[PDB]
Design a protein around this ligand. Sequence first.
Ligand code: ZN
Ligand code: ZN
Lengths: 329, 49, 247
Amino acid sequence: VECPFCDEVSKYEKLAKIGQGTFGEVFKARHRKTGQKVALKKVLMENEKEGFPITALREIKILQLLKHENVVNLIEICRTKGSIYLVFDFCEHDLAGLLSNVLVKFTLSEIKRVMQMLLNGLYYIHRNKILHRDMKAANVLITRDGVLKLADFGLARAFSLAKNSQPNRYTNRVVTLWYRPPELLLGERDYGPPIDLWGAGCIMAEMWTRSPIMQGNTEQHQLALISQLCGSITPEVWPNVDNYELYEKLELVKGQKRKVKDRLKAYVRDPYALDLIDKLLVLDPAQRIDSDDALNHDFFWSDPMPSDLKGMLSTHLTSMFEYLAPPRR
Amino acid sequence: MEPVDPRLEPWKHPGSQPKTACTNCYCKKCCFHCQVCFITKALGISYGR
Amino acid sequence: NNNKRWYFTREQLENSPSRRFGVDPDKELSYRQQAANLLQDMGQRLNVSQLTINTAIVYMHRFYMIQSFTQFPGNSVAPAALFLAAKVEEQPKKLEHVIKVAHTCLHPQESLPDTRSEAYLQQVQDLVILESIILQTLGFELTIDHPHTHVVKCTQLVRASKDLAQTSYFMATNSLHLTTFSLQYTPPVVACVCIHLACKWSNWEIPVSTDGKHWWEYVDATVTLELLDELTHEFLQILEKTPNRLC
Ligand SMILES: [Zn+2]
Ligand SMILES: [Zn+2]
């Protein structure tokens, strides 16, 4: 069977597993001729009925559409004469890992550059009518050269730019709990780019806190913490939040006041940074700041200015002795 | 056979099923009932044997 | 060539995979038209949008520039392409639904094999299998542009009559069904051919915009009237070569 347009993964040499997923889910590899570092991601099909996963087809279609400096780059789709592999340009680090490793240091300036690339990436995908739907620190990669890439579009979909007519009815259970915006927890099915910016807000907080700020155990619990940090969810700060079916049928604390800046105060410090986080963590999506304005927020245009990530990248080390040994005699 | 607004996102597109059943009649009108009737009746194209 | 990968010279369309397996030119062309009719038939049965059927037909036309009608009967590939297309154009139909409709079309007499029988489960597998081969054959290029999009945009732009608008759109569909224009000319050009043709049948001569370009220059910059007349002549020959033209 002739197959001139889907090469065998044999052209790459697997080097190592990336992370602790399944048997052969993600592999670091190199092109046998160019030496090009890539990551092979197997299309998982344990659940077989509806054939090739519409979820995979969406990812592929979206990956082939999105081409931008701050979005993960899909090189090609290969096969093993059977599995299918999405081949990506390899990025050495994910943000979740860099932040967990508290030995790595981030200057305010570097944090600025990180958020700038992230917001620029989100602008691009939203401009192209795509919603990421799986924002979280682990899906934000950073290359050895210091370039951030939005990754894992495995749960992304296209949305309609409809200010016009009918209501869209998109899949409601999307986005990891800890990063899920209020509107979704409330049953919203006609959501848009704001669900991703909420995530950009949660991630921004972590740049200082070093770990997810709202780790709910359940949807009801997740809503609890959002109320506790952002302020009770009322029609006063979110007009018409009333109409949500689940608005009633859900335990919902009523006396909470927005404590966003106070709680992050100790961690963040810089007022511009706290203001942007405050605007990103707004309950009502229509009032939540978008990527465009976020990019033009004073945070990115006030001293200290965005800098490259060379410094932060030098604090990432090669082993125990380098991390733990003092710098001297 | 019937124009569809291109600007509609794919999932917002109407189904192609004809509003009425496909008769077995052959006349300038029944031969243009839908794309299927046109292709099979008026052009005599068919996938079966 | 990546943007040129799925466009073929008149020569390559000749030296097709099926040809190398002793399939005659006009025979291959009927196979394509038969596959398209099936796709359109099951499509309407499933009530998938026209966009789904159109995309499925292009998947079909491209599939056969690589694989042969010999090794892959159009009646097998069609169900699979349509299943894949419904997913791609965001109006998926369950695998069983498609298998039913397909059986009803290819076997109006017989009855659905027990959804528990070996034979059944078997085909449900063969469909899945075929789907994967189609995906691999197409090199996973799923996003398709159809003439229809440029047709409506143009007719609205020139204020065509509702009737000319509909005829043009209708011809775009027939271009996918009866010709291999989708394998030779870009959707914008094909759109122009479908309008030019519709304009001849209604003896309408779209006015040349004030001291400037002709209507088709608002759809594609490479199109020339010379090309439109030729392709239109060709579309007409193909129509004159279909079966029935030889209340
Ligand atoms: Zn009909
Ligand atoms: Zn009739």
